[PDB]
């Protein structure tokens, strides 16, 4: 079904004879020549070292927060570590985090009983989920937790517990009690990474290298984690200083601003059309003619 | 005044549903001959015009 256009016709019809006519067998599509990968030129490494190696984490009722921005995050430095008892990601896959960008990342840092690590997931219910730290049901992020008995047991009673991302600081507060005598009763440290995909420029990005930029030629691309394919071109689409993408009626991206030099690129999908095979019947001839619909003959 | 024909549209349903994605196109094959009978219907309308 790829030998010649008559064999595409026979396969399209699920038939070994083709009767006389014109048959749309396939779509012609010019293939991406190469991949263009484009990311902001900033090179600060993100403070995950500070997040995961702090001397004391906070209580789950009064959980700590850090905002991460203007930096490069090699999430494989975290994901490859044997330390983490769970690394479960919601709305993202941990393999893909290095290929990708976010406008901010928030790290939420706190200590819990090991039995309660279950409650730090989107849509959970119970005393930690509902009265201490609630994740939204559309969460886009990773929950990263490990037992911390060597850091946080003594006993130790400085950690306490009693609304998506609320800090609900009368006082219904009850302490944990952490000793080596406590596996599910042990202290667990947890960090939750929340990723901001809102309509703004990227500021946290994976470590993946940028390429040179290609124009007037069909390429695969990734701009700030926006994967796609097209003929990129310079453009007269007059973006205002705050605008970063242009969009089509179908919600698909139609233009981008390069993160490295802030010029505006059109995205045109690579040249395509219906392919129709004009044939007499196979009882008359195996000779065919091919109509490439909606193309100029120089573009075939 | 009488209408006699209408615009001969045709829709490439694999590119409408799974626009240039092999990951999606391999899932769209599991629904069988829906995409080929949508093309058959729109071709029949277009030849009729």
């Amino acid at each position: 079904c790829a030998l010649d256009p008559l064999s595409e016709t026979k396969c399209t019809l699920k038939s070994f004879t083709v009767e006389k006519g014109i048959y749309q067998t396939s779509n012609f599509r010019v293939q991406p020549t190469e991949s263009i990968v484009r990311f902001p030129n900033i090179t600060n490494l993100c403070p995950f070292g500070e997040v995961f190696n702090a001397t004391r984490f906070a209580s789950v009722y009064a959980w700590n927060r850090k905002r991460i921005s203007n930096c490069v995050a090699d999430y494989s430095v975290l994901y490859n570590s044997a330390s983490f008892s769970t690394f479960k990601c919601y709305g993202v896959c941990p393999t893909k985090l290095n290929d990708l960008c976010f406008t901010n990342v928030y790290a939420d840092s706190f200590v819990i009983r090991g039995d309660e690590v279950r409650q730090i997931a989107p849509g959970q219910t119970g005393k930690i989920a509902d009265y201490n730290y609630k994740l939204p049901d559309d969460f886009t992020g990773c929950v990263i937790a490990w037992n911390s008995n060597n850091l946080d047991s003594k006993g130790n009673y400085n950690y306490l517990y009693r609304k998506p991302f609320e800090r609900d600081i009368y006082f219904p507060l009850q302490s944990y009690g952490f000793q080596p005598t406590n596996v599910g009763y042990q202290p667990y440290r947890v960090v939750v990474l929340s990723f901001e995909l809102l309509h703004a420029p990227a500021t946290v990005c994976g470590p993946k290298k940028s390429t040179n930029l290609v124009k007037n030629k069909c390429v695969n691309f990734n701009f700030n984690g926006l994967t796609g394919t097209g003929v990129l071109t310079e453009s007269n689409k007059k973006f205002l200083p705050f605008q970063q993408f242009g969009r089509d009626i179908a919600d698909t991206t139609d233009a981008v601003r390069d993160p490295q030099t802030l010029e505006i690129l059109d995205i045109t999908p690579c040249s395509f059309g219906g392919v129709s095979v004009i044939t007499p019947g196979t009882n008359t001839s195996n000779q065919v003619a091919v109509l490439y619909q909606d193309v100029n003959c120089t573009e075939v | 005044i009488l209408p006699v024909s209408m615009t001969k549209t045709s829709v490439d349903c694999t590119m409408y549903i799974c626009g240039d994605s092999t990951e999606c196109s391999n899932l769209l094959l599991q629904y069988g001959s829906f995409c080929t009978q949508l093309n058959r219907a729109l071709t029949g309308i277009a030849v009729e015009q």
Binding site: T252, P269 | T9, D12
Partner: peptide, 22 residues
């Protein structure tokens, strides 16, 4: 003719008879 007035896989095919054949 004066008084009577795309990439997503949607296409328009031309009629067999042009307005000049009609």
């Amino acid at each position: 003719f004066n008084k009577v007035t795309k990439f997503n896989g949607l296409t328009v095919l031309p009629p067999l008879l042009t307005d000049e054949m009609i």
